[PDB]
Structure formats: structure tokens, C-alpha cells
Amino acid sequence: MKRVDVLDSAMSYIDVGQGDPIVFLHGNPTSSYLWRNVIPHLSDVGRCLAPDLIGMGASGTSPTFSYRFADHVRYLDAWFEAVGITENVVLVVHDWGSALGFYRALRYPEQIAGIAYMDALVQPRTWAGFTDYEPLMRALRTEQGERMALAENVFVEKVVPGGVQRQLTEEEMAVYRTPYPTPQSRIPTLLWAREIPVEGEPADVQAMVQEYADFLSRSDIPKLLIVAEPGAILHEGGSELDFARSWPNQREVKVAGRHFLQEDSPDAIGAAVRAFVLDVRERQ
Amino acid sequence: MKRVDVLDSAMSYIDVGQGDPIVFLHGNPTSSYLWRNVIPHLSDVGRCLAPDLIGMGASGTSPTFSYRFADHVRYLDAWFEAVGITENVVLVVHDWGSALGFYRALRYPEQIAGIAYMDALVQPRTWAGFTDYEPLMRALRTEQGERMALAENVFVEKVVPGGVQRQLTEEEMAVYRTPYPTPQSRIPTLLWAREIPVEGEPADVQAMVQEYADFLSRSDIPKLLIVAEPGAILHEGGSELDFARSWPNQREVKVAGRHFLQEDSPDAIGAAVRAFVLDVRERQ
């Protein structure tokens, strides 16, 4: 991995290949590791970059423990600028990664050549859309959350295995556990749970997400929507997937998987993203 | 103790006596407990209020783990407004409590009848000014701080006993460690170490503290400076105590103690504050 100072911390990142950039943004509680089997379908047709968000993966931590969505936006902005990823960017995004990439395309659309997204935060959430996850996420946003996320590491020990159809090896789980050895190291996972805009709160993230939803639903940026079956956030019959399916200049591809679909169908995801990237580069 | 909702958390506070308000503000890593033997010298001549800052004492925690100085400013502002402590207020402040009270004085001087302060943050600091705390406070502002503050709870187990001349009882230490049973509960103590403006950094805190320093050094608000012998932040020979003695309309008293002087001379402190308060109310 490479590494670069960002603000008061340091961000590690995968950087393999040549050409126009293809940026892979992970979510909670994962890292660039999640993309390991998808990137090889792309590293001969583009410069693949996959950063670990601050406090996650192999990256540095926030010395002020500033782990809100706004903080991650600032850290990732600093990373884009430091590395020079400002022209003809294909974003490949998932979970909070989508929120970060969507927001970036909102503010710098001239820099974005295309967006491929999966189980994404496409608009502010409602509790109905959480379906199977509603009791857990609700509890994480009450005072129980400190125990569940920090003392019990629930995202790594339960959400990750729950969100994969196949059985993870012990080495895979060891990799996912590596950034989070102590309760005081797991604050980013709790914050990501508490930052989700659900029916108005938190109001600042709700505003940012509403803004990029309003923009992307009218933006002619080329898009690939990868839908997992049965999926999680974006699922058949759900209001959020319906909204995503309204977006313009968009193609859709279906693959097998739950929330962490990369662990179940990486080759199909990589093949779809590769067709997309070639198509997008054709019209530059 | 009383308790009131403030922003997204809840603040516990002592509220005893009646009449014009006298507000006692503690710093790192203490709580209103620090004033327990000072308030009885005042509660027959004023409404004494002593809030525990968010994440400390008996108060609720910050669900987003937002523990910077500006966050505490917002939470304490919400307390001031909810309890309506906005007229004829005498501030009795110490350590980071002083920064908060000073900053309140800066923005709403019409609400402030007088300020009694001890071992306070009167202006941005220099590393020399730290004297024998310099090794600790340098280390905490490096990557070792997480181990020292979160894993070892250095501020409660070491800094508090080291800042009192007498030996603290078992019950006293049991109280002081009550908010901090786990590493993930100790984030406020580390944030407080990292937020001190030292030689320009952090720059936002430095701007705030410089602003209230410029203001208070020229303000005619009545002041009582309680100087501890030998003290810690405000010591003989130091530039910070010299600047503090620059401040107008001020009376100075001396008592025995180190940083946590309330634990060694609470009756002297209480008598000085009571005298100051009665004078302030007589002139108002």
C-alpha cells in the first residue's frame, strides 16, 4: 500500500495500474480489502485506487476522534487533492463509500466520468427500508450502542458475517478484525451507524445526502447500478432501490449477494464494472 | 443533582441555595465534585450551580464522541440557556472550566457580574510554561497519548493525585475514577490534553483563547484571582500569572496548593470567593 498525509492524519491506499483513475470507496466496517477481488478485473484498463478511510483499515486515526461524515468528507477530499485524482474519475462505491463519492460528485461533477454503485445510500433513509436490520441499527443509535459497537465489536463480529452468503475463512475475519483490537479503536463503526440520516436525523447529514440525491436524480453522469439479490439497503420492493432506478443515464446489472456483495460475487461485479469503464472511456 | 437536556446529550448539575447565580466550572479530569467543599461557603448567599461537563462527572456522554473545546462550548451554552443563567452571573472557574467561562464572558459580558478564577487558561500557552508537566503533555499530544490516557487513565490515576498536596482518600479517588471505567470512556481526558493552545496549535482554540485574553485584559468586570502556592499553570515567575496580574478591577488572594488547589485549601478559597461575591452584589 501507498500512504499520504491528509490533514492531521495519514491515509493508506491501493494504487495499481495505469491510465485514467478508478476509485473504489468502501464503507463500514470494511476497507480497501473489500475490493481485493474486484480490482484485478480493472487494473489493466485503468489506474485503480482504493483508500482506507481514516480510523479504518491500514490508515492513521483521527487524533481528535473526529469521525463524523463531515470529517470523513474532509479527510477524503484531502486525499483526492494530495494524490491528484481530479480528472476523469470513475467512482466505484458501496455503503458509506457511496455517500462519500456521491457527495464528491455533487461538488466536483466536472471531475467525474462515471459512477458505479452498489448497496448505496441513495437518499435519506426511513426505518421501513432497514427491514431485517431495523432492530440492530435502532439499538446502535440508543445508549446501548457504546456496548454493542465498542465493547462487543458488533459490526465486525456479526454484521460482516451476516452480510455475506458464503462462509468467511478465519483469515478473512482476522483481516477485518485487524483495525479494531480495542473498544477505543471501534468508534468509527459506531459513528457510521449514528450518522445515517434516518427520517431527518442527524439533520446535517440528512441535508448533505438530500442534496446529492436531488443532484444525481437529475445528473447526466454515466452510472452503473449493481443490484445484489437479495441485497440489503437496495432490495426489491424497497423505496430506496426504486428511487435509484429512477436515475438518468444509468444501466443496471444484477448479482448474487447480501450487503457485502463483493465477498459473494466479485467476478461478476468486476466484469460489469469493467464493461462500464470501457464504455465510459469510449465517450471522453 | 439536577439534570437537563442539552443538544443531543444531558447535563447534570448541582443547584443549591437561592438568589443571584454563582456558577462553578471544573476542568480536566474532574467534575462539580471538585467544588464540593467550596460551595458551602456560598450557598447561603447565592444560587450555586455546578455542572458536570458532557462526558464527565455524572453527566451524559456525547453520542457522536464530539469532545473538542468548541463542542463543550456548545453543550455548556445549551446549559446556560436551558437553566436561564443569563443575568448577574458570578463565574467561579478553573482549568478548562476557566476557558469555558472566560469564553462565555467574552461573548455575553452583560450577563457577567464577576469572575473568580484559579489556575486558569488566561492566554495561549508555551511549552516552557508547562514546567514539570511538559514531558507528560508533550507525550499525550503524540501517538502515545491513546495508550496513556485511554488505556492507562493517566489523568485520573496519576495527574489528580500528583496535583494535590495532601493524600486523597480512597473514597475521593473512587469518586474521581467513577466516570472513567473503560478506555472508551476516557476520550474527554485525552481531547482536553490535545486541545490546549500551545505555541499556535490547535489554531482554532488558539484564536478563541487569544480573543478572550485580549478582551479580559481590558475588561472592567470585577475579578478575583486565586493564586496557589506553588500552583501549576499560574506560578510565580511565569508569564501567564504575570499576564493574569495585568487584568483590571482585580483582587488577588493566595492559598496553598498545586493544580487541584480546591482539594488542599477549599475553606480559604470559599472565604475569598464569598468575600468577593458579597462585594460584587453590594456594588451592583
Residue numbers in the entry:
A (entry chain A), B (entry chain B): 1 to 284
Quote the paper:
Haloalkane dehalogenases (HLDs) are α/β-hydrolase fold enzymes that catalyse the cleavage of carbon–halogen bonds in halogenated compounds through an SN2 nucleophilic substitution mechanism, producing a corresponding alcohol, a halide and a proton. Recently, database-mining searches identified a new haloalkane dehalogenase, DmmarA, encoded in the genome of the waterborne pathogenic bacterium Mycobacterium marinum M. This bacterium causes a tuberculosis-like illness in fish and can lead to infections in humans, particularly those with immune deficiencies. However, DmmarA differs from the other members of the HLD-II subfamily as it contains an aspartic acid instead of a glutamic acid as the catalytic acid in the catalytic triad. The overall structure of DmmarA shows a canonical HLD fold that shares major structural features with other HLDs.
Crystallization screening and subsequent crystal-growth optimization identified two chemical conditions, at pH 6.5 and pH 5.5, where we could reproducibly obtain DmmarA crystals. The first structure originated from a crystal grown in mother liquor composed of 0.02 M KH2PO4, 0.1 M bis-Tris propane pH 6.5, 22% PEG 3350. This crystal structure was solved to a resolution of 1.85 Å in space group P1211, with unit-cell parameters a = 91.816, b = 61.381, c = 106.689 Å, α = 90, β = 106.256, γ = 90°. The Matthews Probability Calculator suggested four DmmarA (∼33 000 Da) molecules in the asymmetric unit and these were identified in molecular-replacement searches. The asymmetric units of both crystal forms of DmmarA (pH 6.5 and pH 5.5) contain four protein chains (A–D), of which chains A and B form the first biological homodimer and chains C and D form the second biological dimer. The active site of DmmarA is located between the main α/β-core and the helical cap domain. In the active site we find the proton-relay catalytic triad, which is atypically composed of a nucleophilic aspartate (Asp95), a base histidine (His259) and a catalytic acid (Asp119). Careful inspection of the electron-density maps revealed an atypical mode of DmmarA homodimerization that has not previously been observed. Precisely, the DmmarA structure displays a new so-called back-to-back homodimerization mode, distinguishing it from the previously described HLD dimers. The DmmarA homodimer is assembled due to noncovalent interactions between the L5 loop located in the main α/β-core, the α5′ and α7 helices in the cap domain of one chain and the corresponding symmetric interface of the second chain. Our crystallographic analysis, supported by nanoDSF and SAXS experiments, provides evidence that the DmmarA enzyme forms symmetric homodimers, predominantly due to the specific composition and conformation of the L5 loop.
